[PDB]
Subunit: 334 residues, 4 copies
Amino acid sequence: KELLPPIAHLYELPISKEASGLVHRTRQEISDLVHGRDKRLLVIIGPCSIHDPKAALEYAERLLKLRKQYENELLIVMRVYFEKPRTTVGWKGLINDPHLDGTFDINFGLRQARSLLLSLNNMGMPASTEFLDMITPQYYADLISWGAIGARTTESQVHRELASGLSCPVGFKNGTDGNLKIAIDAIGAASHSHHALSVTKAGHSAIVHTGGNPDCHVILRGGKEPNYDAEHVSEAAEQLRAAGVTDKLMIDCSHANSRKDYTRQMEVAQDIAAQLEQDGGNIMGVMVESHLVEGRQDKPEVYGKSITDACIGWGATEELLALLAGANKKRMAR
Amino acid sequence: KELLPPIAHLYELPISKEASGLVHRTRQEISDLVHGRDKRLLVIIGPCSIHDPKAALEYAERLLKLRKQYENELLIVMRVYFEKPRTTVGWKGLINDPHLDGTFDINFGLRQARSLLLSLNNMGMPASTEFLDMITPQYYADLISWGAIGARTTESQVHRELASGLSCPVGFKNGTDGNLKIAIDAIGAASHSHHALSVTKAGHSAIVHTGGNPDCHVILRGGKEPNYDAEHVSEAAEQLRAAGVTDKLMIDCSHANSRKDYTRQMEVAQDIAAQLEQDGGNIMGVMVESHLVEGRQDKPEVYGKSITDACIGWGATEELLALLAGANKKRMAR
Amino acid sequence: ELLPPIAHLYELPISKEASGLVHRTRQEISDLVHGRDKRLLVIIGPCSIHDPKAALEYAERLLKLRKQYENELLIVMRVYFEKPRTTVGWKGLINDPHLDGTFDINFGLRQARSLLLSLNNMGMPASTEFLDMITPQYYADLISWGAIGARTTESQVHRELASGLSCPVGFKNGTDGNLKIAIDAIGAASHSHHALSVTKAGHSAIVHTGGNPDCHVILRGGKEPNYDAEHVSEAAEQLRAAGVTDKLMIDCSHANSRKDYTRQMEVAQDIAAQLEQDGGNIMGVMVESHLVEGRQDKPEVYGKSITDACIGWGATEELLALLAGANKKRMAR
Amino acid sequence: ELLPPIAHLYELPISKEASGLVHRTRQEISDLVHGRDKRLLVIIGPCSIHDPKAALEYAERLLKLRKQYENELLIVMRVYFEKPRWKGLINDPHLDGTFDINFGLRQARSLLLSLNNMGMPASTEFLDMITPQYYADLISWGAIGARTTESQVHRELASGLSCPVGFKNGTDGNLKIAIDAIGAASHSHHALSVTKAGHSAIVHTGGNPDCHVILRGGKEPNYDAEHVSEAAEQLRAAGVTDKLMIDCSHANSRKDYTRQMEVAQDIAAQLEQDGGNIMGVMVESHLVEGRQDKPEVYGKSITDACIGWGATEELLALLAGANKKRMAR
Ligand SMILES: [Mn+2]
Ligand SMILES: [Mn+2]
Ligand SMILES: [Mn+2]
Ligand SMILES: [Mn+2]
């Protein structure tokens, strides 16, 4: 199959006025969190990965009510990640393999991804994703209010350059090691201007002079040990001030910080709430892996149940958000 | 100024019949080493970085003599790296900054890199390089007999896919932590077939189905602790066997193993040499950083003196190669 | 920003049934060009397409005649998107799809492919004029017979294009009355060429064409009209002397009709008589027809040309029954 | 695999001096088209270029006459790579039927650049929608063939070119097609083209205000005073420049090279009597006269027969002398 260029997809699914309005302001609102001008708490919450658009839309419908209810405390954004990167061997995600049958139908996957994101934004839910790849971003980055670079790629030069060219805030994860320095450096690198090689909306390789991305930050996501608590937060903030970059950071309640057990996500959030109640001046956000139904499954049999990492279910998601708004209500009052 | 596609470079500088046979043959020869079919020692030696083609060619002429001289003991290949990754400080290498003046001139830079490579293979010197991104390899991979993926991108899914479609053998580095698993996972992923995005010789994005690369292997390059000795090699080999991948590996004499001191490359070589005399079954090659003149300089004033990592000079290079040839002749005769 | 053909092919893939109609009809026409079959090819429909709704209603009506007369005539609809005008005027549905002087080529190519896919799906093959080297890729797969413009029959690059098409192509005699250029053009179109063109992915490239063996001539007047037996017999002699097929198409409209739509029927009558007598050299005719007769400067009335004047449906029924009847007798000898 | 223009522009960028010469020659020919200068444009040289060595040798000689006659004639070399029919130098640069277009475009661009750099401006016929951008930048004057003057896509092409362009009457002898072609190419167009990078694209051309007609025979040869007055009328009637070019070879010579001089004589006399509407002539000329089927003799055509150098000297002197008088009055 010939790969369709971005312009093909952009022509069928142009950004709407409302969607570009929401991306613009959500980007702006998050910038304010990164630089300490607003004290609301970014919450990146949703499925480990998107495998069904229908489930994703219903998830977004519920999430949206809670984003509106808690809007003075939290800034809620949906995880719309298309894949779980592989150490090896599972399913590569919606874009790479949208039919979940090992066919590669990238053209269909990118169309479906663009469509899901346009629809979420159109209903009022801004969206987040991880940019793995140097070529796919162009397809839907205009519908993204916040991007991640993963633990496995935060050290990659071309990923740092990718980030320097995006128009959304970007979070960089510490190494699968626990190494924070690679993420701090990455901030350095992404904030500067670069002469990169990328591919245009028309599908041709090209030189792009990036403008630098001034709204990057660190994500604490565990390593050898969990790095979510106050002491790890304090040490990180120190390192961040020493490199002269922002000391506002995000914490991932999931992955290595929950030690690969979804039931511990709540416990990590409880620890974060307590830091917000005492002080927690260095935290601008959190990350949660959440779905309609808890746990995981190998085959997409059950509706709204993850097929990559296990997630908490809707019930626990309600509790968890209520917990963080409350604790953040108090921090914003001091 | 606009970016030229690989076909423009291939039309000025087509691969000669001699270079392509030299490449086909050297790749096959290295595959024999990776899979334990031959017991010669692969030796990847040469400047930390190429900043001058003239000095580079003169280096190769001398190195060519030793390659012939030790051809029954050592398989010698020139290091032809166009940069040292640098986290935000200094010269971006010869492809990005070919004029060494801080400008960016990638059309000139890719042209000059291909020229050099074409001239090295025509004189009878095979070449090795590090593939950093997904776009530039297409400009000269046909001239490369062995490649490396940088420690910084070892975990990167997109670099693993890159390696899976390269036709040369590829070596992957243990992590900046001393960590071997990530290199072994990389061999895993790079040996499989992948559906990925890349850019054709014509400069267009496209879907590629890679065939998988069977000749990948590990490179031991230190972590917090140097990892060139018997014990580390023994331990490395076990992990490799337990993962069902080749237990033949390469050891970096430079950088962390040298404790970042160019005067210690010889020490590490000695240790490797004693392993070869004794047993050394699991060693298939070594990396060495070497130039016409020893040391380093901040600015490119002195002819044939590195402006990136410090290198051993030509004299010490002859002594080291002689030491390795002699040790390996002994291994080969048992 | 111009979208490559692959973008339109992804949204509007050719269906199996369209695929089979195109294939079948190109072969069927091929047999007319080379005299293996004696049915009369009729290219018929509006001068230009300005409204897909009317074109669809027209195709529906035509399809029924296509079947009624299926043993005497091979009816293929005319789906031209413009009349080339040597003065100011509407640039046609591909360039100006919105009919407001806008240029919106993406929308226009998409709409053209869609109409053409809809027509093949309903069971009506389609013909068109290929006017340039770039747009045909977007829908050539949906076309059973093509024409090269009278203005481009001498153009080497348009001859190279015909050599690459997989449908039969017709070449017109020169506004002069000139037949040599069409004969030369068949000459050239039948050979392999190494030309430059644009790929499905939107890139310039070298293509090696295989030759198009199913080309033929179209008689479209002077100067003086050239549809009668005397002109026909003369064309055939030259075609033979050139060693190319001596089966030809005659255009009932335009200059052969003295630029008057009410005279298309008279040209058809004369062709009917020739078919009744002998007319062994005629393999097809061309007719400008719409739902309603005539023309109008603005698109005010439904199914009425805004380019050249066409006969209406009433006259269309009459003209076709005449050629079926007359060709029935040809085929029975 | 077709290289894009940018690959050839990267190897062979226009020099400071070539840029100057092109801009100046377009501007000077423009002056002839619009009646600010009364020199005679002479488009002269080989029928087709099949050897760059010969072409550079010919240019070297033509240069000397371009200087000698710079106050009377504006001499521009004819650098046409083919004759519509051997498929020409760009298609078949090796003259062996192997179609190495990449080599042929490169060699085409190289020769053009050398010619400009030696002080010799250059003209060619744009046949094709895709090739022009590989070297339009080195051309001071373009032609559209009689066989494409009616083509809409070739009119649009000329609409986007920065050099004056001449349009031929048809193989008819039909002038109206070249007249409607000026109208069309003078307007702005939304046409499809190919970028310097090799991708198809929408380009909005700005219009070409320096176009004009080329009289090149019928029918009956159409070079004389009467035929000229007839064309002028129609051109004025059509509201376009009544200043035109006359081809001395091809139809107007009855396909006879020896007769080229004859046409030039008629033209000279008009230039002396009055000849106000003539701004240019075209002549087919090589180092050696005649023609050949195989390229065995150096400097001799293998498409249309040309005059040799000796006759070129005479034909040029005759046109300069005649035009000096016109410019005197
Ligand atoms: Mn996950
Ligand atoms: Mn180094
Ligand atoms: Mn018409
Ligand atoms: Mn000629």
